[PDB]
């Protein structure tokens, strides 16, 4: 609005910012409003585009990387006079792609917390701690307790001797160069595991146990961030905060994240914001104002840190902050976090060796999505670690024709007791985000769908004495997958696919597909999003038609009741010769009611038909004669009962013509047919409006008699005929 609006999380000191907003108002006359709405990090991309976003946004740098790739943040341009007021490394935290995208405001870092009563002189090295633990154990106490389930707290030691996630040499992160496999990480984890083996620590320890312990006076030491402190103050423990122990002569690295403020690229007032950020907020007065209201922690302005630095506590956060590394901004951080955590836990529980866990972890950070899926696959099929797998040798993102990188092929023995035949279970890989580096699918985050948000599956009844699963279903999946990408049609459980081809290139009656949720596969959380599994179900042309006329869900249920045609898990039998309706005539009945009580999903059809026609004008007619093929005539009840009685339109379009006939219900909007003038036409396009009573009467009248079939009324006539449309006499 030419005024400055700021959105920030509910915890920090906005009133101080409001005071700075008042100070802004005094010196410049511009009103500064400060609000702190919920879930802002998610909201900013959503509203930033419209223009109702804030001019300035405050948050830890880790989000900003996402914001920067989406193009929501403006480049900031501070003079050297300014960049020198702040520490060089805080600027590093705000560089993406070599550009500066925010003013660093506050830095948070983990530190070593000790009880002054128990340990007057804290250890300067980790190697001392065992003996110290032994000493503390001597008086019924333990030395150290911290979260071993989350890598944020164990990474310093893992990072201590040379380990790293990504190295940025020019402000740009090399995503290939991962450092979870080197001697250092291995050194740290063996040491952690060794600490746990010698019962100096317990793999079970969590936030609350560690916190309860220090606050109750049960344990001697901890590692934590500023937020925890408030709770220790209430505990009245006399404690000091200092630098973390060194390992093998090198500093521990605690991830340091700096609260920063960025300027919205869609803001008119970018320069006002720059003036404000550089000359008012980043001053002793603005920061002091904010500090009194709610402490920021260790600030980024050298001058101000010195004022704050007497707090032994602040000193330690900044000592640790300088000694530690800055969090990466790329989205793959999410991938790193899942890998490590599993590695640490597995190494600590004895499930895996240190070398193997970190070796496994380095690799899993590369293609997490594939693996996460492999996880779900592993839960169902522990018996089959390696299944026959079709690989696309020419990868899609290098110009390849096949978008599914892998299709795994399993043998499911089934359950005879549940009437589930033995079958082959195909799972696809590529529709979801496997790699998460933007090679095929744009990265979206943990929230929201990974890639298209699903993978395809298929269940093919095993023929007797078949040694191996056939491969044609993979080619089918590739076909569908291409459609997904090109077609950009939504795929949800219940949707149908018109193929018109043998699914397996045989003479089978199964020539179409319906889609449903996989019976036994549960969806998964991959760092790049959520993945669900859509199973393909082979159907006959008649069954597809029923699905179109009613809905997919209903026909799926019908397929579940007839075991040969699907059963509870919907196994496709290509060899199947009968439709579900030929097997049980009463199923047709269930379909008709569904159409009655649900309406029909068919908005129109392409068929042989015509009406009497003849720079364009909307004509009105008092007489109308419609002509239909037997095939289209058959749908007239559906057109009337299914749509008009539910206030829904229906459209016939001529295969051979530009003619069209749209049956219109009352309450439809946008028709040029009125109750006053029911029959009207625009060029070859005809709309006819029918009142519900008339519709009911017509329905009674239509019901075998020899073609041609003629119906007549006091205003309109109808004919059903066959080859006349196909072949004219003139």
Numbering used by the authors: 5 to 618, 625 to 713, 720 to 746
What text comes from the article?
Although the crystallized protein was intact, both SUFU molecules in the orthorhombic asymmetric unit show no apparent density for the C-terminal domain residues 279–360, suggesting that this region of the molecule is highly mobile. Since disorder often impacts crystal diffraction quality, we generated a new construct (MBP-SUFU-Δ) in which these 82 residues were replaced with a shorter seven-residue loop. This construct was expressed and purified in the same way as MBP-SUFU-FL and crystallized both in the presence (crystal form I) and absence (crystal form II) of maltose. The fold of MBP-SUFU-Δ is essentially the same as for the full-length protein, demonstrating that the disordered residues are not critical for protein folding or overall stability. Collectively, these results imply that the IDR in SUFU is dispensable for GLI binding and repression activity in cells without upstream pathway activation.
